[PDB]
Amino acid sequence: NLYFQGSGRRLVLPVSARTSGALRGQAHALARRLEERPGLRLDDVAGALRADRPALRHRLTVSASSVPEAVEALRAAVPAVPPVPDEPPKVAFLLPGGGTQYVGMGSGLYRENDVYRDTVDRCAAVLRPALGSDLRTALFEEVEPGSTAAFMALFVTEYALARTLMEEGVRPDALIGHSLGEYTAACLAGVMEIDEALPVVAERIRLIASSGGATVGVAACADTVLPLLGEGLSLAAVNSPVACTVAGDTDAVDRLEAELTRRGVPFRRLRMPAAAHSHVLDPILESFAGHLRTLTLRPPRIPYVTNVTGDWATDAQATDVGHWVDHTRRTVRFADGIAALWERERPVLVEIGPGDSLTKLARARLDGEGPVTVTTMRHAKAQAADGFVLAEALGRLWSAGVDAALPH
């Protein structure tokens, strides 16, 4: 059952000291105090940790739904982020592309968080005409892998999760999306309106899927891979010094994999039999533009880097149908874009969506600038509750210096 339950007992307990060393001890002191004081309710400690202490430079948090849990976590507590900077840090949202979606994602947030519930409900209703079904079936019960609904489930999950973070007062200073995630970024930035984007993204997915072809993810930098392509092959994504993807017709991809295998290059065929970001899409570009022409495009009110150039999007690009056509046809320059995003703001990098695929690419590309990264929703196999994962994210954001992230 996905009946609304509201927020749990789950609370975030903040701790801040003036030394990394006083942090460890003060977290252990608080643990002893909770043991030796059965009067102390958990909600009073939480409120008191906010109102009665100054938010100092060295921070950590625990999440807990009860007192023994909080005590256990406070003993194991290790500072995890650097001391907060003197100016408040910038925040960036990283919005993943296809590949991480799964049935059941965000079902915990759907039942605890009314912004997440309402955003999902609204998107599901807008999408019924283009999709032919209720998206919430695909989100929470069952879905055909790689279907239109499966990818729309990811788009709406990213969008709902970002709205949920923004309602907590975590608003991004910059955005970057990977592939499909660039549409979520555009909706969040004000370039597109979510209600107009939803059916257009859906028809876009259908046109890409019906174009056939194949995509292979290669664990190597693009400079190593480029000489091996390939009539019938395009560089589909340049993701990090050890990650790129190649797309084209199936026979050409087969041949590339044989050559990669002869050179010891690790690779894996992506499950979706499509070839987004390659010449295979040429026959549907004009028809896709016709759908793009239904959108009211506006200049971004939150800055974002586009995968077309791997750089900040201009107002002229954001509002241009042919640029959005380029976004679908051309290499996703994510490695360049994450470096452009980092050089300007040095922001906290917050992955908005299931898993940690963009976080790993950011860490590989930004080595060793020491980026602070925050993950926001679990992988398909993880046993953690969605609301626990979210509470941890918000605590960690507060520990990095994003004060509005602490709930209550």
Ligand X SMILES: *C(=O)[C@@H](CCCC#C)C(=O)O
Q: Could you say whether residue 95 binds ligand X (CB under 6 A)? A: no
Determine the longest span between alpha carbons in the chain, in angstroms: 73
Residue selected from 165, 198, 272, 402 as contacting ligand X according to rule CB under 6 A:
272
User: Residue 327 or residue 378: which is nearer to ligand X going by CB?
Assistant: 327
User: Residue 154 or residue 349: which is nearer to ligand X going by CB?
Assistant: 154
DSSP letter, residue 278: S
Q: Could you say whether residue 208 binds ligand X (CB under 6 A)? A: yes
How many whole angstroms separate alpha carbon 126 and alpha carbon 135? 10
Q: Could you say whether residue 276 binds ligand X (CB under 6 A)? A: yes
Q: Could you say whether residue 354 binds ligand X (CB under 6 A)? A: no
For tokens 């995630």, name the residue: 181
First to last CA, the chain: 27
Smallest separation, CB 179 to ligand X (Å) = 2
Q: Could you say whether residue 102 binds ligand X (CB under 6 A)? A: no
Smallest separation, CB 107 to ligand X (Å) = 22
Residue 75, both tokens: 């003993």
Distances (CA, A) of 62 to 5, 12, 74, 266, 401: 23, 6, 7, 39, 16
Which H helix or E strand runs over 273? Answer: none
Residue selected from 2, 130, 209, 221 as contacting ligand X according to rule CB under 6 A:
209
Q: Could you say whether residue 179 binds ligand X (CB under 6 A)? A: yes
112 to 151: interface string for ligand X, x by CB under 6 A: ---------------------------------------x
Specify the amino acid at residue 67. Answer: V
Burial label for 368, CB within 10 Å (0-12, 13-18, 19+), is exposed
User: Residue 272 or residue 335: which is nearer to ligand X going by CB?
Assistant: 272
Q: How many CB atoms lie within 10 A of CB 225?
A: 23
Distances (CA, A) of 33 to 70, 72, 94, 330: 11, 13, 39, 59
Smallest separation, CB 186 to ligand X (Å) = 12
Query: What is the footprint of ligand X within residues 277-336 (CB under 6 A)?
Result: 328
How many whole angstroms separate alpha carbon 310 and alpha carbon 347? 17
Q: Could you say whether residue 83 binds ligand X (CB under 6 A)? A: no
Q: Is 294 helix (H, G, I), strand (E, B) or coil?
A: coil
From 268-276, 305-313, 341-349, 364-372, give the range in contact with ligand X by CB under 6 A. 268-276
Q: Which residues bind ligand X (CB under 6 A)?
A: 97-98, 151, 179-180, 205, 208-209, 272, 274, 276, 328
